[PDB]
Design a binder for these strands. Structure first.
Ligand SMILES: Nc1nc2nc(Br)[nH]c2c(=O)[nH]1
Ligand SMILES: [Ca+2]
Length: 314
DNA sequence: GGTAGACCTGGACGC
DNA sequence: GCGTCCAGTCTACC
């Protein structure tokens, strides 16, 4: 009853709502689609994960997003805590206004969007977002998900346990920069990225100026932010774009990967024109990004999130 | 300035 | 049951 993961039905008094129609958000289309890797549908239509250093379970009805938080006396999320959720899902951004616009200038988008509504971008923590995507390169979402879980279990603060699940906060820079981290990460199965994580944490803490340097890029320009991130080991064009779009408030950033290349070729008959290469390469990937920006506008990265999410569900 | 190949690690084929 | 193919970043040499 009071044990295990909560469900809206089981612990009624332990849930607070926030107005949000499925047209503004679809948990099942945002949480497991490769933006954040820390949410799990422990119970049908109920997603659990760490949000703002606390564990939460979320579920939705046609017009409501139901939230419950596990902190001592179990109580309802307060108005402030709920505000943290609104911020995570960037709810001030009207997804219906964006879909209308993109669909107005892109007939193919209008078509896909008609069946994949509620795909918006999570506003993530720079650090969590940075190392999670360092683990993403040349990998698949399912594997990346386990790597990130083992990484947080081994180096992150222990939060609380529900059923046989112990939740952990994302490791700090100091922890990731500690001694022998790479070796431990390799036993955890991160492959060659184990080096990127260790090397990137130290680089940030010992050469770039620490956490302030990262949290800073958020006020800088996409052009600025993207160049800086590429300095870090394991952070190429894609990873840096994912970070700019999902954690540094650069909504025009467009991560270019195998999925976006397939979407470009199959749904737009796109081809590189300013570059000599016929396939993926540093030059062609940059062109594709510009292409999608030119097509969708200022919030091109968000539109990209819709097609990418839709391309996974296949 | 612009490419071939190696990288870790499993699922998903295909024979 | 096995050898490939897949889901980006970094460097050789150009
Ligand atoms: N373009 C793109 N590539 C990605 N890889 C991962 Br893993 N997640 C994403 C994403 O949201 N967009
Ligand atoms: Ca590939």
């Amino acid at each position: 009853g009071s044990e295990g993961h909560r469900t809206l039905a089981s612990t009624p008094a332990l849930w607070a709502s926030i107005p949000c129609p499925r047209s503004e958000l679809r948990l099942d289309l945002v949480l497991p689609s490769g933006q954040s890797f820390r949410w799990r549908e422990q119970s049908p239509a109920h997603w659990s994960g760490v949000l703002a250093d606390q564990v939460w379970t979320l579920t939705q009805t046609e017009e409501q997003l139901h939230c419950t938080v596990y902190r001592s006396q179990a109580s309802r999320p307060t108005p402030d805590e709920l505000e943290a959720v609104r911020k995570y899902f960037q709810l001030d951004v009207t997804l219906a206004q964006l879909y209308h616009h993109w669909g107005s200038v892109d007939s193919h988008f209008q078509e896909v969007a008609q069946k994949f509504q509620g795909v918006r971008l999570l506003r993530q923590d720079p650090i969590e977002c940075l190392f999670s995507f360092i683990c993403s390169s040349n990998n698949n979402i399912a594997r990346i998900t386990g790597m990130v879980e083992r990484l947080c279990q081994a180096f992150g603060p222990r939060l609380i346990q529900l059923d046989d699940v112990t939740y952990h906060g994302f490791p700090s820079l100091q922890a990731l920069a500690g001694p022998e981290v790479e070796a431990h990460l390799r036993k955890l199965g991160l492959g060659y990225r184990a080096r990127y994580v260790s090397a990137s944490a130290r680089a940030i803490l010992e050469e770039q100026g620490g956490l302030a340097w990262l949290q800073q890029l958020r006020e800088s320009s996409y052009e600025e932010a993207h160049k800086a991130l590429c300095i870090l080991p394991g952070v190429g064009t894609k990873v840096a774009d994912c970070i700019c779009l999902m954690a540094l408030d650069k909504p025009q950033a467009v991560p270019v990967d195998v999925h976006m290349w397939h979407i470009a070729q199959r749904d737009y008959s796109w081809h590189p024109t300013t570059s000599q290469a016929k396939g993926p390469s540093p030059q062609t990937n940059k062109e594709l990004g510009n292409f999608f920006r030119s097509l969708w506008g200022p919030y091109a990265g968000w539109a990209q999130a819709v097609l990418f999410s839709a391309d996974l569900r296949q």
